[PDB]
Design an enzyme around this catalytic site. Structure first.
Site, PDB file in Angstrom:
ATOM      1  N   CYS A  46       0.752   4.258  -0.704  1.00 20.43           N
ATOM      2  CA  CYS A  46       0.314   5.595  -0.229  1.00 20.43           C
ATOM      3  C   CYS A  46       0.708   5.730   1.244  1.00 20.43           C
ATOM      4  CB  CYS A  46      -1.184   5.795  -0.410  1.00 20.43           C
ATOM      5  N   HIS A  47       0.565   4.663   2.043  1.00 17.69           N
ATOM      6  CA  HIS A  47       1.053   4.705   3.454  1.00 17.69           C
ATOM      7  C   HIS A  47       2.211   3.724   3.667  1.00 17.69           C
ATOM      8  N   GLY A  48       2.654   3.021   2.622  1.00 20.08           N
ATOM      9  CA  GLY A  48       3.699   1.991   2.801  1.00 20.08           C
ATOM     10  C   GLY A  48       3.147   0.794   3.550  1.00 20.08           C
ATOM     11  N   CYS A  52       0.910  -1.167   0.000  1.00 22.99           N
ATOM     12  CA  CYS A  52       0.000   0.000   0.000  1.00 22.99           C
ATOM     13  C   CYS A  52       0.929   1.191   0.000  1.00 22.99           C
ATOM     14  CB  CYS A  52      -0.913   0.042   1.213  1.00 22.99           C
TER      15      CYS A  52
END
Ligand code: HEC
Ligand code: HEM
Ligand code: HEM
Ligand code: FES
Lengths: 383, 137, 72, 416, 39, 122, 85, 244, 364, 50
Positions: B103-105, B101
């Site tokens: 976008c947030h890692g 993910c």
């Protein structure tokens, strides 16, 4: 005979406006009906002037609304009217239902009238919701999506009805176009329903704050209650101007100004304020089918109310316990509306379940039980 | 006359996005546009399909299983977002080395579930009804 | 200097804002202590001073708001 | 012809050789208008007691009007002088007659009369209209008093009333018929002996637009009346007010001429037979008047229609009255005045009323000359001044559910 | 009728009163009064 | 709506038993005083829902004097509600004047209706 | 029906009732508007207050308890109780 | 939700245009547009505003036209079919710095700077929020919070992490009227300009509202008087009931 | 005076400068034709002439200010008119065209006459005293003077009958023009040049006057709602008109409404001597509540008899006054009031109302 | 007939034809204000047609 009676058209206008023998003891609450009618005009009027500029295509709906606001000469005024006037339409409709619940305007001689009332209510909600979906903001789109997903819970036809609603496989261009068409239309069906409402009102006339028969003292309507209608209308328009011109977006939700994007759900989904109570009820019941059934029952149980109300005396004005029950019901309805906008959280899920429980218990237990108790108390006290 | 309300050609067809299942290689991103959104999919590798069958659903916090997730066994898919709040999906990273993910890692599993990281809920499936030697969404 | 920073400095020194600044600073100290342990990365609940910061900033905003635009 | 006798009393006579019968009467003003609520009806009771005395072959009757009272002794011409003496005696011994009187029987008679005026629908409607129009003042009181107040009257009350009002300055001897005036005057002078005193101050009265509704659903019709502040006997518009009233005239649905009467309202109300009957009138008191109509509606569903049409026809008074209507009204008012002054009893009553309440009586020829001077523009000016948009007083008795409340009828007074 | 003409009297009266009070209450903020500084 | 037959049935069910009578009757009078209809000149039976065939028959079979008194009381109540004012304590309807005048006629009407219904289903 | 037109409104036979009134243009309009709108309005509010206050007090007490509990749950001290729910 | 999730509630600054009878400070609109073009145009589009909208608001028609020529726009391709471009004109909408959302996300670590033509009506706090957002960055993020790489902490942003990062710094812009350019001044100016861009009818709307309130309040008082007057006969009714 | 038709004209000065012209059709009253014809004829008089229609003649008359009516009396049919002195040449001419060439159109018989006649009959009979008087005339003068004074549906009349009763009546010998306040010479000229000159001297095939045939000792009872009324009727020869006018005025007469008279001492009581060409009827009536009337009629009977001859003589002047009051233009009266005693033993009796309460003739 | 209720306090102090003139003034002012408002609204809406 006078021209206002000989001519059939003027005869009708007279029977309803100029000589309607209204009771002499009606409060200002009885003016709400006129306001509702006024609002029905405004919703239509401004409405007809928005469709002249609104483009129903999904890729143009929001841009078309912004074109109305920014480019059309008075477009900002027409949109702010058509929106805040819908909010005020529902304010006046809730007040008109509250008045009919407090005073026994739903009792025997007017049960038929009451029924049309409920239907109007139901129909109106649809219209309002549908119109809101036309803006195609974030909250608009996702409200449409949530509504259709919930209606997807019908036992067998549910899987098939939703594509007929969506006109596709998700809220898209066909959905917005059909919503625009049906939203332009259904207001005229509602005008017909309002005509039926007025006919059912004229057959037996209107009730009184005292409940007792008004036939002993009835007044014409042209010099009386038309000039009371003007006070109520001008107060309505003054508050409506305080909203439309100053803080017109107070009643709306800011997220509705973000163009609809299916790939990103907003933090919270709430209907426009006046549908919040029922939405809360919908969330109080876990089952989707249970939720939709419970909601539509929350609207339809008004039909059961005239039969569960076992009161010999019309109205609450002279009843101690029933007034307490009515105000408790009203405040629980406001509590349901409040819980509608609040996230489903630890205390609020249980509070909403209890609030829905009491909302239905009102009609099916409290009104009959309290009415019977007060009948017995009246008879025992007088003896 | 009420049949007008139903999906209109331009919708009954075209809306179901038939795409050849055979073309995709087992290891890579066959990132697809579907349901007017991202629609990323990987025909399952034999080892990967087996590894998933062995993995316990109970072990994952998310209550989901590979068998329910995949309609046609080897061929399935996910819609375009790694995390419950949309996260652009990275490829072959995370707790199991399936997706990141980015976008947030956060970590997305080969299952596609919210294996770790910010996802409030597991990633959704773009119309999951893919069938035979084709996909559809 | 911009008026906003001096208004924040004046408000945070006010008696009403003093307890919030206090709580926030010992919260910072406590969180730094929690970060000192070698096992911090493994802790499920890693404290933060977001709430104290919000309280302080709300109590400072309630003071700066009415006065700021008189400075501009 | 006038002669002020000793004591200052005035003998006014209108002798005509063609008179069928002669009449002579003593009138001392101070009708119900001079009374008050507690002692209302005392004037009528006193006049009845005086008129109940031995008639010596004449016909002694009481007058009992709103503002003046008197006893009239009708008799054939040659006997007139005797009747003169009679009434003189009856008035020189009025206090003695009242003292020696057992008011019981006279009070049941007066109560029967008061019930009569409260049963005859027109009498009840008009009495209520007068009461509400002048409410708060003595003029509102019934001419004959109420059944509640009559029973509470005693001899001392009548004696006080006579002492206050039966004085030379407040009394007139009116006569008519075929006789020598000097003979009657001489006969009365030798026999009339009444107390001295100043003419009592006539109490004030002011019109007040109001509505009174005695709805009795058991009656078969709706007896309503609507009127505006009219013209008193002093006003120079007196005959002009009568002409305005006659412009709309009378109407009886079942009369043969009902389909041919000139007034427009008659043609209007016969299209659906809105009203059974109506009559326009200009009642004139000493200083104030009531100008309007009385009406009986048979169909209880058409009271509002009749009121609407009648008030619209009143609106026509200030705009569209034609020379035909004005000429008809003038002729009809002249004929009505001449009819009212045929019977010697009526002539005597008229002489007494005028001489007491205005001081001077305009001969019938002078009245004709004054009426013939009226043009249509004068009538329209009067309509603008007194009818157009002026407050109305309303009254109704039965089946008046359809009589819309005040504001409707009042607003009808100014809509074009 | 005279309603049509008379409505102009009141509309113009209120319109001019407000369009003379507004540009006096806000004269320091309107464009036409500020444009001089930036010209 | 609840029939006066059933209302009176329940009321006599309560009144017969001394405990319930003692507990309720004071509460019944207190409730009827707090109801506030007496302050507008209305007796209890004036409040009854007139718009029913049984009740319409009951009024249609009232004596003359009771009918006219009821008309005047209803008109007075309408006027008081119209002018937003109440009768002073001395002019209000006292508890002893709330005499349940119309109940017997309604009970007779319901007796007739109930016999007709029973015989139609003989 | 239970309400006819003006001629027959369904009112019982009415009789002996006399209705007096005065015209407008002859009555003081707003005769006691200022004094009444204060004193009589206060009287009406006093009579009707409890019926609105007791239900309002109950509902708003419930709402306040729920709101305070929800605020407490989402704090560094309410984390544990939030987890337990 | 947690206080962090909802985002710190912005306070209520006494903006010059809050009260029912105050307009925008058009000086502030011009200064805010300057700050916009200088800073915000690097990332934010603000598409729904056309140069023509600025004439008579913050720029004379000549200035707006000149600003139009300074930019290039796509015209109808030449009769030979080749692409052609023209200098901008008043009717043209202001151009964003990115051709599409894909480019904007690519150039901002995946974050998409939203179009600002509705950012004031599309956020809870409205103008205040924007101001509180632009000056809400603390020099030191609150202890304990860890931000995803590329994000900067702003308490007023829902979730506490915003990809923007502080932009307004002291004396970053030389105002055209010599106004000092403190960061707070720039933030107020930008918030006011964006509020105008989201509510161009604000001044006209409130003037029409004042006229409507005057008319309707006078008319409502007249209606009150007329109703009380025409009801005086009814409220003054007096009855009698006198049976035998 | 007279014209070749033998139409009598009488004219004399008047007090109130109104020419109260009146025409008296001698024997076209309710006595002549079949019961009720004279009423319908009186209702047809002023509607449609051969010269001016109803809507024209009525409008012109009202412009001129005059009044006109047609009243039916058992002896004669009276057409009264009342107008200013300037207006004689018009009305007289109209009256001619009323007696001659009255249209009698069926649409008037069905729209203006029968409805109006029925309404008048119902209104009059609603009064118990008038119903009692009609019954008293019926039972005292069985035919002729006893015919009902107003049209009643019990004796249907068709338009042809009314038209044929206008003709065969209205003849020169059968009409007497009387005026008050009009020069007799001018009136004679106007009548001579009007339509009155064209009337036949006498009816060729009608107007066979019948004898009076007074009957006494009879009684009747007419049940009626509302007010009750008991009446006592003495038939009297014309030469006795003087005796009873003195008797009536002695006890109380309708023409002289006054208290202090013996009959006025009892509620609702009155007396009146109806006077006709060939007979008269002295009626003592009491009206009101049935219980009150029961004793009232007996008291009135006891009062009428046992009236002191001294008081009867005292009442001579009052009777002369009453005769002078009654002698209007239409009903000329020539009765010499003598104090001679008047018997009552030959009375007819009629009761109306609550017949269970009202007494029978045997109780007087 | 009977004693009317005393309206002394309710009676207006102003002239007979004057109070109705003032009533005309305010009713006409209401009518023309309403006409002006309707004119403004109708003009604003029709301006959208342009
Ligand atoms: C360079 C890149 C810039 C500049 C010069 C400005 N902004 Fe801002 N912006 C930018 C990013 C990367 C983002 C992402 C937001 C996110 O991570 O959610 C934004 C966003 C905004 C927002 C959204 C706020 C919200 O949704 O709560 C607003 C409002 C906004 N930007 C306004 C704004 C203003 C007024 C500026 C003045 C110079 C400005 N931006 C500069 C990137 C950049
Ligand atoms: C009682 C009847 C009606 C109600 C309650 C109602 C209510 C609403 C509401 C609440 C909205 C949301 C708009 C927004 O949030 O911006 C809306 C939108 C809309 N309505 Fe109505 N409406 C009614 C009748 C009509 C009618 C008759 C028309 C005829 C054209 C109409 C036309 C529209 C249009 C075009 C929109 C799109 C909104 C926009 O473009 O801004 N409505 N309606
Ligand atoms: C556009 C919407 C509506 C209009 C125009 C309308 C119209 C009216 C009017 C003119 C009246 C008479 C004035 C009054 O009693 O307030 C009235 C009364 C009433 N309203 Fe409506 N109505 C509407 C919607 C509703 C709804 C939705 C309900 C209930 C769900 C309802 C219930 C009633 C009832 C029961 C009455 C009779 C009140 C009484 O007699 O006491 N109405 N309505
Ligand atoms: S939700 Fe944004 S990272 Fe998964």
């Amino acid at each position: 005979m006078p021209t206002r009676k000989s001519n059939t058209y003027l005869s009708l206008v007279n029977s309803y406006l100029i000589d309607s023998p209204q009771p002499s003891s009606i409060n200002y609450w009885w003016n709400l009906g006129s306001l509702l009618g006024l609002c029905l005009v405004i919703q239509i009027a401004s409405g007809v002037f928005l469709a002249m500029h609104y483009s129903s295509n999904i890729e143009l709906a929001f841009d078309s609304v912004e074109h109305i606001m920014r480019d059309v000469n008075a477009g900002w005024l027409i949109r702010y009217i058509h929106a805040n006037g819908a909010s005020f339409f529902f304010i006046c409709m809730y007040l008109h239902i509250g008045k009919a619940l407090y005073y026994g305007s739903y009792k025997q001689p007017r049960v038929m009238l009451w029924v049309i009332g409920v239907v109007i209510f139901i129909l109106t909600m649809a219209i309002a919701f549908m119109g809101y979906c036309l803006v195609y903001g974030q909250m608009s789109h996702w409200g449409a999506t949530v509504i259709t997903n919930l209606l997807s819970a019908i036992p067998f036809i549910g899987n098939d009805i939703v594509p007929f609603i969506w006109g596709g496989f998700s809220v898209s261009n066909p959905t917005i176009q059909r919503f625009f068409a049906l939203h332009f239309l259904l207001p005229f069906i509602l005008a017909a329903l309002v005509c039926m409402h007025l006919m059912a009102l004229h057959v037996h006339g209107s009730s009184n704050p005292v409940g007792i028969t008004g036939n002993i003292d009835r007044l014409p309507m042209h010099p009386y209650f038309i000039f009371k209608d003007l006070i109520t209308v001008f107060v309505f328009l003054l508050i409506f101007s305080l909203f439309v011109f100053y803080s017109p977006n107070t009643l709306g939700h800011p997220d509705n100004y973000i163009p609809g994007n299916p790939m990103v759900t907003p933090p919270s989904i709430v209907p426009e304020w006046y549908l919040l109570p029922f939405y809360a009820i919908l969330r109080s019941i876990p089952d989707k089918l249970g939720g939709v059934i419970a909601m539509f029952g929350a609207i339809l149980i008004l039909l059961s109310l005239p039969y569960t109300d076992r009161s010999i005396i019309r109205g609450n004005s002279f009843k101690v316990l029933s007034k307490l029950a009515f105000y408790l019901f009203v405040f629980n309805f406001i509590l349901l509306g409040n819980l509608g906008q609040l996230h489903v959280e630890v205390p609020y899920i249980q509070l909403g379940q209890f609030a829905t429980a009491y909302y239905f218990a009102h009609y099916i237990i409290v009104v009959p039980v309290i009415s019977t108790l007060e009948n017995i108390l009246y008879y025992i006290g007088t003896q | 006359f009420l049949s007008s309300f139903a999906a209109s050609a331009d919708v009954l067809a075209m809306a179901k996005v038939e795409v050849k299942l055979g073309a995709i290689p087992e290891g890579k991103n066959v990132i697809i546009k579907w349901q007017g959104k991202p629609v990323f999919i990987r025909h399952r590798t034999a080892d990967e399909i087996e590894e998933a069958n062995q993995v316990d659903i109970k072990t994952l916090r998310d209550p989901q299983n590979d068998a329910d997730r995949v309609k046609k066994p080897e061929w399935l898919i996910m819609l375009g977002i790694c995390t419950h709040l949309g996260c652009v999906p990275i490829g072959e990273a995370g707790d199991f080395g399936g997706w990141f993910c980015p976008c947030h890692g956060s970590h997305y599993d080969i299952s596609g579930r919210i294996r770790k990281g910010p996802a409030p809920l597991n990633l959704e499936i773009p119309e999951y009804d893919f069938t035979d030697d084709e996909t559809l969404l | 200097a911009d008026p906003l920073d001096t208004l924040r400095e004046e408000c945070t020194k006010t008696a009403a804002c003093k307890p919030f600044d206090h709580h926030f600073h010992e919260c910072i100290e406590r969180v730094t202590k929690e970060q000192e342990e070698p096992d911090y990365e493994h802790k499920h609940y890693k404290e933060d001073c977001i709430e104290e910061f919000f309280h302080l900033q709300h109590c400072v905003n309630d003071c700066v708001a009415p006065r700021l635009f008189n400075r501009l | 012809k006038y002669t002020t006798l000793s004591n200052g009393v005035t003998v006014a006579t209108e002798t005509n050789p063609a008179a069928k019968t002669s009449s002579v009467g003593l009138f001392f003003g101070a009708g119900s208008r001079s009374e008050h609520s507690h002692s209302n009806g005392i004037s009528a009771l006193t006049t009845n007691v005086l008129a109940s005395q031995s008639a010596k072959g004449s016909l002694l009757t009481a007058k009992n009007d709103r503002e003046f009272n008197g006893i009239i002794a009708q008799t054939t011409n040659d006997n007139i002088t005797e009747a003169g003496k009679l009434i003189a005696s009856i008035a020189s011994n009025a206090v003695d007659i009242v003292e020696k009187t057992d008011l019981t029987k006279h009070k049941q008679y007066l109560s029967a009369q008061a019930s009569a005026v409260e049963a005859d629908p027109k009498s009840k409607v008009l009495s209520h209209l007068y009461s509400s129009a002048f409410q708060g003042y003595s003029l509102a009181l019934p001419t004959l008093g109420t059944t509640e107040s009559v029973e509470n009257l005693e001899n001392q009350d009548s004696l006080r009333h006579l002492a206050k009002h039966l004085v030379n300055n407040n009394t007139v001897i009116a006569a008519s018929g075929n006789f020598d005036h000097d003979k009657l005057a001489d006969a009365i002078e030798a026999n009339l002996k009444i107390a001295e005193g100043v003419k009592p101050e006539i109490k004030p009265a002011s019109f007040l637009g109001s509505e009174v509704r005695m709805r009795d659903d058991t009656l078969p019709k709706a007896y309503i009346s609507i009127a505006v502040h009219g013209e008193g006997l002093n006003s120079p518009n007196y005959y002009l007010a009568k002409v305005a009233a006659a412009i709309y005239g009378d109407f009886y649905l079942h009369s043969t001429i009902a389909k041919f009467t000139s007034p427009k309202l008659a043609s209007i109300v016969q299209e659906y037979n809105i009203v059974e009957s109506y009559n326009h009138y200009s009642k004139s008191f000493s200083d104030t008047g009531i100008w309007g109509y009385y009406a009986e509606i048979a169909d209880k569903f058409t009271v509002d229609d009749f009121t609407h049409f009648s008030l619209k026809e009143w609106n026509r008074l200030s705009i569209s009255i034609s020379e035909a209507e004005v000429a008809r009204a003038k002729a009809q008012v002249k004929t009505a005045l001449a009819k009212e002054l045929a019977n010697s009893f009526a002539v005597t009553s008229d002489i007494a009323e005028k001489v007491l309440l205005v001081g001077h009586r305009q001969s019938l020829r002078e009245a004709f000359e004054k009426i013939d001077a009226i043009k249509v523009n004068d009538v329209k000016e009067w309509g603008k001044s007194k009818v157009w948009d002026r407050d109305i007083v309303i009254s109704g008795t039965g089946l008046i559910e359809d009589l819309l409340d005040y504001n409707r009828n009042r607003n009808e007074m100014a809509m074009m | 009728a005279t309603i049509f003409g008379g409505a102009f009297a009141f509309q113009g009266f209120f319109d001019v009163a407000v369009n003379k009070w507004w540009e006096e209450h806000n004269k320091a903020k309107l464009w036409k009064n500020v444009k001089g500084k930036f010209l | 709506v609840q029939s006066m037959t059933s209302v009176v049935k329940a009321a006599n069910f309560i009144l017969a038993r001394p405990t319930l009578s003692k507990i309720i009757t004071p509460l019944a009078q207190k409730f009827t005083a707090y109801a506030g209809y007496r302050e507008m000149g209305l007796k209890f039976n004036d409040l009854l829902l007139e718009e029913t065939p049984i009740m319409q028959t009951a009024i249609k079979r009232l004596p003359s004097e009771l009918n006219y008194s009821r008309n005047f009381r209803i008109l007075t109540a309408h006027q008081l509600a119209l002018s937003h004012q109440l009768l002073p304590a001395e002019k209000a309807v006292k508890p002893e004047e709330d005499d349940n005048y119309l109940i017997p006629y309604i009970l007779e009407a319901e007796k007739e209706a109930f016999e007709k219904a029973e015989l139609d289903n003989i | 029906t239970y309400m006819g037109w003006w001629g027959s409104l369904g009112s019982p036979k009415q009789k002996y009732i006399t209705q007096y009134t005065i015209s407008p243009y002859a009555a003081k309009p707003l005769k006691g508007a200022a004094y009444n709108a204060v004193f009589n309005t206060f009287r009406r509010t006093k009579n009707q207050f409890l019926y609105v206050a007791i239900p309002f007090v109950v509902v708003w007490s419930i709402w306040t308890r729920a709101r305070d509990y929800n605020e407490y749950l989402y704090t560094k001290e309410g984390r544990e109780e939030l987890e337990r729910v | 939700m947690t206080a962090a999730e909802h985002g710190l509630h912005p306070p209520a600054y006494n903006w010059p245009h809050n009260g029912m009878f105050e307009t925008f400070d058009h000086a502030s609109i011009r200064r805010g547009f300057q700050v916009y073009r200088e800073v915000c145009a690097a990332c934010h589009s603000l598409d729904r505003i056309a140069w023509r909208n600025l004439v008579g608001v913050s720029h004379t028609t000549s200035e707006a036209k000149a600003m139009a020529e300074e930019l290039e726009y796509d015209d109808e391709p030449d009769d030979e079919g080749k692409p052609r471009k023209r200098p901008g004109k008043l009717a043209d909408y202001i151009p964003g710095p990115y051709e599409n959302e894909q480019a904007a996300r690519a150039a901002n670590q995946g974050a998409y700077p939203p179009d600002l033509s509705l950012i004031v009506k599309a956020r809870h706090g409205g103008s205040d929020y924007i101001f509180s957002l632009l000056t809400g960055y603390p020099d030191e993020p609150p202890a304990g919070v860890v931000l995803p790489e590329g994000s900067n902490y702003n308490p007023y942003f829902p979730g506490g992490a915003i990809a923007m990062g502080r932009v307004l710094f002291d004396d970053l812009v030389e105002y055209e009227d010599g106004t000092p350019a403190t960061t707070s001044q720039m933030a107020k100016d930008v918030s006011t300009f964006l509020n105008w861009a989201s509510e161009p009818e604000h001044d006209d709307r409130k003037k029409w509202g004042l006229k409507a309130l005057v008319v309707l309040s006078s008319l409502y008082l007249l209606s009150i008087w007329v109703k009380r007057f025409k009801w005086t006969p009814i409220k003054n009714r007096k009855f009698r009931f006198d049976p035998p | 005076s007279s014209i070749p038709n033998s139409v009598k004209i009488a004219a004399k000065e008047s007090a109130t400068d109104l020419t109260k012209l009146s025409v008296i059709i001698n024997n076209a009253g309710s006595k002549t034709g079949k019961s009720g014809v004279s009423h319908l004829l009186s209702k047809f008089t002023f509607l449609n002439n051969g010269a001016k229609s109803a809507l024209r003649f009525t409008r012109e008359s009202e412009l001129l200010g005059g009044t006109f009516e047609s009243k039916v009396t058992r002896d004669a049919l009276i057409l009264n008119t009342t107008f200013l002195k300037q207006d004689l040449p018009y009305y007289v001419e109209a009256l001619g065209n009323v007696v001659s060439n009255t249209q009698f159109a069926p649409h008037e018989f069905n729209e203006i006459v029968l409805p109006t006649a029925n309404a008048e009959t119902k209104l009059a009979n609603a009064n118990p005293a008038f119903k009692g008087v009609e019954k008293l005339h019926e039972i005292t003068f069985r035919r002729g003077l006893g015919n009902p004074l107003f049209y009643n549906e019990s004796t249907p009349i068709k338009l042809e009958e009314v038209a044929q009763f206008s003709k065969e009546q209205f003849s020169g010998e059968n009409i007497s023009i009387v005026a008050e306040g009009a020069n007799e010479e001018d009136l004679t000229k106007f009548v001579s040049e009007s339509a009155f000159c064209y009337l036949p001297s006498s009816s060729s095939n009608g107007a066979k006057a019948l004898p009076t045939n007074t009957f006494t000792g009879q009684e009747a009872r007419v049940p009626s709602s509302g007010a009750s009324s008991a009446l006592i009727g003495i038939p009297v020869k014309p030469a006795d008109f003087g005796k009873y006018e003195v008797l009536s005025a002695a006890i109380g007469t309708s023409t002289l409404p006054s208290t202090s008279t013996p009959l006025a001492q009892i509620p609702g009581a009155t007396s009146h001597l109806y006077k006709y060409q060939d007979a008269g009827l002295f009626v003592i009536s009491v009206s009101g509540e049935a219980s009150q009337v029961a004793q009232g009629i007996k008291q009135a009977k006891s009062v009428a008899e046992s009236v002191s001859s001294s008081a009867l003589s005292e009442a001579v002047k009052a009777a002369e006054l009453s005769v002078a009051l009654q002698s209007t233009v239409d009903s000329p009266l020539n009765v010499k009031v003598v104090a001679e005693e008047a018997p009552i033993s030959k009375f007819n009796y009629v009761a109306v109302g609550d017949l269970d309460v009202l007494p029978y003739a045997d109780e007087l």
